Each structure stands twice: as C-alpha cells, then as structure tokens.
C-alpha cells in the first residue's frame, strides 16, 4: 500500500493485502473515562493540601495518561486518611476559610474518609500545560485541611481529554527492556 | 529511534543490505519514543496490527527500492533479502508518492501478548521485523524517515501502573 507520506492523512494498511483477515477488537480497557477512573497516590502535606491533579507523579498510570492531553475535564473523588476534622473549601476561596466548620467538614471516622467533589473551577476546561513551568492559580479543585493528613488519593470521574500530547516509555540500554515478570 | 538518535535510516553502499532490524515489541528501544509505545507501558497486554510508515526524503534524482519483512519467532531473523524473501514481506520503490505504509500482522499462539519484556526472555517472543535496501540509484547519503501508529484492529487492555 503506497501513498504520499507528506499528506499526513491517516493511512492504515491491513493484513488482507497479502491475504490475511482482520480480526475483532475490543478496546474497552483503553477508553479514556474507563482507564482514568481509579485512585492514585499523592504525597500529602501535613496540614493544607491544595487539590490539584498535577501533583500526581508523572510516571504513575493515572499521572502519565493525564499529562498526555492539553485540556482535560473531570470531577474528583478523594480518599483521605487524617487526624481531626477534614475541612474542604471550593475553588478560589480564601485560605482563611479552611478554619470554619461551616464549610464542608468530615468528622473523623476510621479507617479513612471518602468524598465526592464537583468540578469547581471557573474555566470551562482545565489544562495540563499552560503557555505564559508554573500553572495559573485558578487551576485547582480547592484545598483540604486537617490536623494532619496521612494519605491522599485522587480519583477522576467523567474524564474528558483534548489535544493529545507525547507519551514516553522507558528507553532501554539493550535491544529490549527486560523486567522480571510474575511467575510461579 | 535509530542509531545516532535520529528518526531515520540512511541508504548504505556496501555488501550489507540490512538497513534496520529490531524486535517486534512495544518495549523495544526503537519504539520507545513513539506515542504508541507510550500508552503501552500503562497496559499489560495487547493484540492487533501495528502499522509502519516510510517516507523517502531523498532528492528527485535519486531512486531506491526497499523491502520490509516480518520474521516470526523460533528462528534467527534473516540477514539477507534473499533469505527474507520467504517470509511475509512487501517491496516498494521511490517515485511520485513519497510514503509507503505496511501493516505488521498480529500472529501469535495466545490471543494476547504481553507489552513488557520479561527479563527471563532471551529471544523475543513476537519475532522481528527487518528492513532491507534492495538497491539504490545515486542515493548515497539520502534519508528514509519511518513512523509508527496503531492499525485498525489494534487492541490494548488490562491497565496497570508500572511506574516508568
């Protein structure tokens, strides 16, 4: 199958050329909303933690797949293990607000506490990369405060991605990347 | 990704017609920079076709003719085009159209294949693909850029966070 490469129009040749037969595909596991819905760990800070999806490590499955889209939208679910009373604050609210029990506050109930949070940012859709290294302060879901927070998790809901970006793998030194695979 | 860290392979004049040769895996060093091998690291298994795109960059007065071939596992891959001619292969040459597209079949015993390459695997399980230069008119020092993208039936499943 020959064509003009400079066209950039996608050209997918198939096995039927030399006499194969194309099989059936089931792509559920690569679906954006499916693959990004799960918890990913973020190293917390003792008291105040601004909820931000860019704090996830870049090499994690949720971190990497997030960063491959310039423009992303989703709700948020958090799972927190903390002491005291976990207080949440909406986007753009003053830091002095986190000390008010009137704001949403989850009294400590062991082992941990799970919340579901709406998309609170003013911008129609958020961004992983911004041209203006820093990202604007308006990108965040708000912050949470507690006497101390031991663990923090993010789970995206209804994820939507736009304008894909490079996704890199580990570069082997030898001809292949050889890892020890689970075996009995 | 090729030697010298350039995304192309240059025509060569010598008894050696092997232009580039590499494992078929999504953990290969050559694939490492692609977007396709970018998603792979977050999934354990895949199936389906992986397409390769070739675009000849040389001047209008230079002509070459190439061979791409698939060497299935179980035997050493071919070192000469005459040896490879028995495999599944395609052959094309330069002309008005600058680009060629070749679909590498998914051919395996099990319906799915691991993305990662196990350390106890000495020889690739999915075999090799080999790119040869049949001949070239006046093509010395002319570049062939190559690209890779998913096919129609390419399917990828079982997400996992491997670090990386």
């Amino acid at each position: 199958t020959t064509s003009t490469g400079e066209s950039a129009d996608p050209v997918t040749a198939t096995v039927e050329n030399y006499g194969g037969e194309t099989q059936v595909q089931r792509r559920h596991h690569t679906d954006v909303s499916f693959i990004l819905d799960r918890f990913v760990k973020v190293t917390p800070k003792d008291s105040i933690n601004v909820l931000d999806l860019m704090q996830t490590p870049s090499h994690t499955l949720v971190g990497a797949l997030l960063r491959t889209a310039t423009y992303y939208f989703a709700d948020l679910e958090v799972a927190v293990k903390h002491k005291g009373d976990l207080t949440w604050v909406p986007n753009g609210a003053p830091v002095a607000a986190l000390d008010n029990t009137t704001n949403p506050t989850a009294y400590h109930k062991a082992p941990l506490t799970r919340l579901a949070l709406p998309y609170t940012a003013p911008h129609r859709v958020l961004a992983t990369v911004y041209n203006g290294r820093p990202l604007p302060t308006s990108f965040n879901y708000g912050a949470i405060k507690a006497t101390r927070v031991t663990e923090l998790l993010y789970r995206m809901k209804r994820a939507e991605t736009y304008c894909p970006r490079p996704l890199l793998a580990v570069h082997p030194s030898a001809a292949r990347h050889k890892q020890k695979i689970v075996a009995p | 990704h090729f030697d010298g860290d350039v995304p192309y392979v240059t025509t060569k004049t010598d008894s050696d017609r092997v232009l580039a040769q590499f494992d078929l895996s999504l953990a290969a060093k050559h694939m490492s920079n692609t977007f396709l091998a970018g998603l792979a690291q977050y999934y354990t298994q895949y199936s389906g076709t992986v397409n390769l795109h070739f675009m000849f960059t040389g001047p209008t007065d230079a002509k070459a003719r190439y061979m791409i071939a698939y060497a299935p596992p179980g035997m050493e891959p071919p070192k000469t085009p005459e040896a490879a001619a028995h495999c599944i292969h395609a052959e094309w040459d330069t002309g008005l159209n600058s680009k060629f597209t070749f679909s590498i079949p998914y051919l395996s015993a099990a319906d799915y294949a691991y993305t990662a390459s196990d350390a106890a695997e000495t020889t690739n399980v999915q075999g090799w693909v080999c790119l040869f230069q049949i001949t070239h008119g006046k093509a010395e020092g002319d570049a062939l850029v190559v690209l890779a993208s998913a096919g129609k039936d390419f399917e990828l499943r079982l997400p996992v966070d491997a670090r990386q």
């Epitope: 082997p172 030194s173 030898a174 001809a175 292949r176 050889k178 | 090729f2 030697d3 060569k12 010598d14 008894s15 050696d16 092997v18 580039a20 040769q21 590499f22 494992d23 290969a28 060093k29 050559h30 050493e76 891959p77 070192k79 000495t122 020889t123 090799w128």
Partner: nanobody
Framework: VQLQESGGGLVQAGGSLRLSCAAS????????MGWFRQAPGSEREFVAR????????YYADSVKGRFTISRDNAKNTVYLQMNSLKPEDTAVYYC???????????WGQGTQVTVSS
C-alpha cells in the same frame, strides 16, 4: 548459547588492552556483537558494535576513536582493542551478542578492567 569475556586486567593511563570474547552454541556469523561497560556506582553504559559481516560498527562518543571493535567469524570470537586508556574507563566490560542495532541479549559474565593513574 554462552559468551565468555577475557583479556581484562590492570593497566596505567595511556596503556592499551585487547578484550576477547568467545561464543558457543550456535552460528556466530549470524549475530551482531557489541560491548557494554558498567562503571562502579554508575549504571551500565554502551560501548561499541560490530555487524556479522564485520562491515559496520558504531562507537560510544567517549570511546570514539580510542577503541576499535573487530570480530572473527572463523575463530567464533569478537575483539575490542582498547587504546589510550583513561582512568574513567575503569569498569566491568560485558560482551553481548544479538540481532538488534544495539546487540543487547545474550550477555557474557564480563571481565574486570582497571586503568590506574
């Protein structure tokens, strides 16, 4: 299929060594051959390559021009001639076989080389 390095030892700066690697178990003239080096405490880095035909080679930049790789298909062996040795070059040198542009798989045990100054 097993490889065995040899020719290592000790030397002082400006010296030279010739490493030797023997292959066994299958056709040696069908494989590309290359060397890796792991300096202690650094991760292991690439060195040099030789195609089965002996025609084509490639050299790591730091070793470019100082070292010369050569294989003997008759003798079922490959050689790395190290020249103008430098205290940085201290490392274990692994002999590698393989198909791919980098030779990769089928590693020997590697030999020890320490250049002193």
């Amino acid at each position: 299929v097993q490889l065995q390095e040899s020719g290592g030892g000790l030397v002082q700066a400006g010296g030279s060594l010739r490493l030797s690697c023997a292959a066994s178990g299958r056709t040696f003239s069908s494989y590309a051959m290359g060397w890796f080096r792991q300096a202690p405490g650094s991760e292991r880095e690439f060195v040099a390559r030789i195609s089965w035909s002996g025609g084509s080679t490639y050299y790591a930049d730091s070793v470019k021009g100082r070292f010369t790789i050569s294989r003997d298909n008759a003798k079922n062996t490959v050689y790395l001639q190290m020249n103008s040795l430098k205290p940085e070059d201290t490392a274990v040198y692994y002999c590698t076989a393989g198909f791919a542009l980098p030779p990769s798989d089928y590693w020997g045990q590697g030999t020890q080389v320490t250049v002193s100054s």
